[PDB]
Symmetry: none
Subunit: 45 residues, 2 copies
């Protein structure tokens, strides 16, 4: 395997781990994260 | 024209309205929003 995780690399199974980790943030922290994500997708392209 | 600055100081106010609207979403919906932003910033740039 690729590491401690049993899942294959580069597959869309990262989305379940992203929802798993996102739920752990406080209300201010999830807002700071989503804002930091939003400004990146605006400055790209 | 020159690339600097990437934007003027004007119209930074979208960020405060983005925080204001992000706080209104349910636990599942704020994660769907952040995931929709994440897959875009991974495909872009």
């Amino acid at each position: 395997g690729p590491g401690s995780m049993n899942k294959p690399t580069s597959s869309d199974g990262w989305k379940d781990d992203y929802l798993s980790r996102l739920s752990r943030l406080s209300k201010n922290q999830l807002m700071a994260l989503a804002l930091k994500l939003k400004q990146q997708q605006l400055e790209q392209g």
